[PDB]
Amino acid sequence: QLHCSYESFDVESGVYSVSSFEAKPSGSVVEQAEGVECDFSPLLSGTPP
Amino acid sequence: VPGEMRLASIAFNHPIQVDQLNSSYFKLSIPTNFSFGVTQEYIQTTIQKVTVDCKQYVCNGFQKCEQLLREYGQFCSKINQALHGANLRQDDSVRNLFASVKSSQSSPIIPGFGGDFNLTLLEPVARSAIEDLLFDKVTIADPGYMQGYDDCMQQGPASARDLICAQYVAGYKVLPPLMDVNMEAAYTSSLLGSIAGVGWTAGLSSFAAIPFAQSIFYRLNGVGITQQVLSENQKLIANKFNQALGAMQTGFTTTNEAFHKVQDAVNNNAQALSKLASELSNTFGAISASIGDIIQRLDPPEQDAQIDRLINGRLTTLNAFVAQQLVRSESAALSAQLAKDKVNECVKAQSKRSGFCGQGTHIVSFVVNAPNGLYFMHVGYYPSNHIEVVSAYGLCDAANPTNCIAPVNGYFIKTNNTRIVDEWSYTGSSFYAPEPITSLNTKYVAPQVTYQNISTNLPPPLL
Amino acid sequence: VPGEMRLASIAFNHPIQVDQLNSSYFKLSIPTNFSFGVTQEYIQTTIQKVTVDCKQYVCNGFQKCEQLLREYGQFCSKINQALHGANLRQDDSVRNLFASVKSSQSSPIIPGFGGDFNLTLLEPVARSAIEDLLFDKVTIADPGYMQGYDDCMQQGPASARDLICAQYVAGYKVLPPLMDVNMEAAYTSSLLGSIAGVGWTAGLSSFAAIPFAQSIFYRLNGVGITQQVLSENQKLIANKFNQALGAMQTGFTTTNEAFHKVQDAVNNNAQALSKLASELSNTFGAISASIGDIIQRLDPPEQDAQIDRLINGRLTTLNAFVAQQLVRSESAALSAQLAKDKVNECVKAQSKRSGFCGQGTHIVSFVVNAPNGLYFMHVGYYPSNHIEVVSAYGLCDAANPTNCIAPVNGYFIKTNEWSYTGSSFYAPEPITSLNTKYVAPQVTYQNISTNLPPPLL
Amino acid sequence: VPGEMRLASIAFNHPIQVDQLNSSYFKLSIPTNFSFGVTQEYIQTTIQKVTVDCKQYVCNGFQKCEQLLREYGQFCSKINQALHGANLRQDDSVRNLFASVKSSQSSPIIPGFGGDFNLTLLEPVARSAIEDLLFDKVTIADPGYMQGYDDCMQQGPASARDLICAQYVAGYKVLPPLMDVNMEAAYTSSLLGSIAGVGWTAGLSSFAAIPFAQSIFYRLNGVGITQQVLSENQKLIANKFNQALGAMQTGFTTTNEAFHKVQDAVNNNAQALSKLASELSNTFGAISASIGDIIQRLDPPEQDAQIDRLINGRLTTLNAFVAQQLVRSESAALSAQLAKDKVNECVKAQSKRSGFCGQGTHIVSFVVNAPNGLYFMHVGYYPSNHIEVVSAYGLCDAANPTNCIAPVNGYFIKTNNTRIVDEWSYTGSSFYAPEPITSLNTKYVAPQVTYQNISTNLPPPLL
């Protein structure tokens, strides 16, 4: 990556920063809930407006 | 309850007036008392060194920016190179400074140094109590490096609010100072070991290695105070000096402008870092500041319209940031050069230039470590209780017009002291101290019409 | 009419050549005449301080802007804070200047001060005759504060075009200077009164209180001119000096570059304000530069879109402007420090450094007030009519080789057998103990077999 | 092949310790050997002056461009004016430098100048061998103006790859330098010829015209070296001096930091050009980077939308470019001021201020022409092999206590030399070299209790 950043096959000696580690992510947990099955029954009969 | 503010004129303090006089004699203002005192200054020498991950700052590993930023990778390289060069420049100034700080030789330093002078500046063998008070008075966030990952992480207090842990979210990196604080303490003690002293000609080869008090007397004779008085008042000198020294414990207040500047230098670094952090939440009209959030709610053909807008503003922020740091880096280098000059002048030697150093003539000055810089202290001499006295341009033999004298580094004044039978007397130029005129304090000069025609007793020359 | 232009080569002013010589003696180039002369410089110490209303700059209080700008209000806070700090720094520098300017003591000053010298620089007991000429030459717009605003309003000339009263449309505020101009003048008068002592040690507490002419002769001895010459030429010196002094009335010309720089500093401030004023009319592709026009011409959804476009360009000009002012402020601060450095050296005492001050060694220098800064003048000393003479490294007694001498502040020259002259000027004199010192012997010292009075033997 | 890197502590080079003695006498550190040595610095004084055609940068005379830039004509004028004023400023600084560089008089210079010193720095009568070595080491592209126009064209080599000829496409213009290099070389030779006078109570009014080595001995007495030693060792001094001089041919490699800085100044000018060149190909999301290509591909209602987008980004690069050049020009002007002050201090005369010049006291220094600036070198005294000796603050002839003396520019040391019968000996402060006590090396002073009590033979004066 350093060679590509300087577009060369001989980067000058030094200490150089390079991109950081992504820190090892793991599987999900949730606090989602609670409720009751939504009732859409007003749509099931009569004439719409 | 307090009342109204009061309109007031700005005072115009006036100089003491002294009448100009014609003919062969003139009034001379001279102080009859003086006091020790100090001044201080802070000169920043460096900018904190930082780098920024140019991928994570914009996008935290999302797969769209893994492709979308590829066409912008050359902007990042320009950003990294500029910052990297700025960091190298800061470390060059450090090495260049220390090359002049070091001495070929120094005295070992022991307790009881300075004799009757207190010298509380001495390290608690250490840095110094004065330096440590400065670091404790500063409101700066808890130090970086260790414990690193574990001071961001839950292995610590819940009350930490350090931007340093936020550097592990944002991908920011703070580089360590080059010099090593322990070596820094050694450099300041090395400077203290060259004290006593600056006199005995250039001093650029040989080292006098003499007691501190003795070097002070040479500095006092360097400003025209006669040694006879100094030998009489030696305890007084130590006491007044220590009073000026004692005032430095009240110097850690906001009315000390140098102290205030140290805090502001710290504040400016914190502000620059926090400015980038605040921009992380700044949408550019994008639906959300989080890339993962907009990915989660958008169809990919329009998803990256939003991502592109977000990318453009984030890159623009980085460009502005680099420019700001480059300017600061250059000003710090220049500021460091000034400090370097003062170390090799104001500290390494007494100077007659005035202007420089504290405003009290110039007598010995000292320097200590400060955050991102150096803090200087200047001992000085303040005249008081000025009186006017009669004085002459010179004295000469009335029996032989080619025989003449004039005072060396002092003045010929009419005698007002009951111990001196002679009509004229010699005084030091920095202080009122009449004394007999002797060959030691005078030199032969070409004759002039304004020199007094002395028809009787002159011991220098007797003839 | 004129003919065709003339191609030419740039002249190279070749230095006078002086040959190095073999053995114990050498050529010495020394002047046989001199003249006083004057040089000048302008050191700026401040940037004019301004602030701007961050709402008025963008809109005239139209309600849509009042709503829309709430999203951008934090930018205005940063704008105001940055400018405010810049303004404080400019006034910090002023306090720091005066800390070095004031003296603990000074002579009273009266008309006719300076004796035989004319001293037209003396205050008209006031500013100074030189400053009066300067301020008349300056092309700056008429001042505000009082009568101020009532010279901006319709009861005033219809022809005013000054940025000074256009600021009440634009919302700019020009801040007053930290110091009253009369106090400033008094400080420079105190500097004139700080002359004598100049020399006689560092002078730091003592105050000699002696005539100006007397202080000059001391300084001329301090640069190697012998006293014998000085007593013979006293009126000549006064005349040449007053010729150099008289030339100051012609210093307010376009060939004086320091003068030109003062005018440019005045116009740098004018340019900064005028740039913002022109941007008030700068349509950014918006339907109009005016908020009221786009409100009256557009459906309210479109009003919001066009007002936002207009606001964005307006904020952008403000941001760039602040950055520009930060750069300027810092350069002035550095320049102000340089003025202080010359005041504590070039003005308060004679200096041997060279480089600094006018390019003619260093003799007394002066400083006066200028817009946003200080204007310095220096009296220079210029050598002329150089001749070459034979000179020797030193002299010894041929019969007593350990008795060796060397000249003090001058040279031993062949007598057109040996004679002493001051380092500053050609003027031979007998060698006497006052003008020489004992030195260790050297192989190049002359072997004198005849007569040396210092030592007699 | 190599193994792993080695971790290391950073060394702290400790100063030679000297014990802090009490009482009337003290240890004195003094060197017993020395070497000449040199330092170098590069101070840039100018940046390249440029102008840019504000129509050509946008397009190659295309008509849509010609009409569409009319609304932006005032930007172009501001661009031209800002750059033009910066160019005038660069030329002002050069003239100011030369005003202080020129001397009213100088010595003629012939081969064999400097006596036994080699002086290979002298022009090959010319510029100088040093300047030509520098110019060969510098990698900068050749300037035009006489002419190289046909080397852009088919009437020159097909292998030319100069960015210097590419300016004809960009509308970029390289301005000629303000002064003829031969006239510049004449100024540097006049600086060599400005040696002697070197002082002698100013020397602004005179020209001593003495041998170069003779002026050096005057300078060596100016740093506390006794003349007795100097007369004995003159050939040795010339040998050490020439060894220091011969080392200058190795100052043309990157371990010389000043040398590296010269190349970086060249690089910075090259960077400014390369950025403009790369931007000519930079589409801003416009359908093509070429105006003619946009024209041949599009219906005019869209054709000018693409062109306008392209124009706006091109104007934006010009704005950024000008701002960058304005900043550099100011820094160059300040850098030039630093150089002229060193010409009137580090070069024109010996100086005692320290800090400045080489780090070894100060003796004669030289300056040569360099690209974009001046290259300085300095020479100085580097003491070594310090020893401690017994020394006294002064001597007071105790059989008659009113006779008190102290050394001038040197010290009184206990005698360790078999040739000298005197109990005390005088030495120069720059080097260890005892001598018999005589009136030339001392001055009468006020009495002090720490001055040694000599009750018998004290010769300066004997009475």
Automatic annotation (TrEMBL), chain A:
The cytoplasmic Cys-rich domain is palmitoylated. Spike glycoprotein is digested within host endosomes. Spike protein S2: mediates fusion of the virion and cellular membranes by acting as a class I viral fusion protein. Under the current model, the protein has at least three conformational states: pre-fusion native state, pre-hairpin intermediate state, and post-fusion hairpin state. During viral and target cell membrane fusion, the coiled coil regions (heptad repeats) assume a trimer-of-hairpins structure, positioning the fusion peptide in close proximity to the C-terminal region of the ectodomain. Spike protein S2': Acts as a viral fusion peptide which is unmasked following S2 cleavage occurring upon virus endocytosis. This is Spike glycoprotein. The chain holds residues 346 to 394 of 1353 of the full protein. Homotrimer; each monomer consists of a S1 and a S2 subunit. The resulting peplomers protrude from the virus surface as spikes. It comes from Middle East respiratory syndrome-related coronavirus. Belongs to the betacoronaviruses spike protein family. It is found in: Virion membrane; Host endoplasmic reticulum-Golgi intermediate compartment membrane; Host cell membrane. Fusion peptide 1 (FP1) and fusion peptide 2 (FP2) function cooperatively and have a membrane-ordering effect on lipid headgroups and shallow hydrophobic regions of target bilayers. They are considered as two domains of an extended, bipartite FP. The membrane-ordering activity is calcium-dependent and also dependent on correct folding, which is maintained by an internal disulfide bond in FP2.
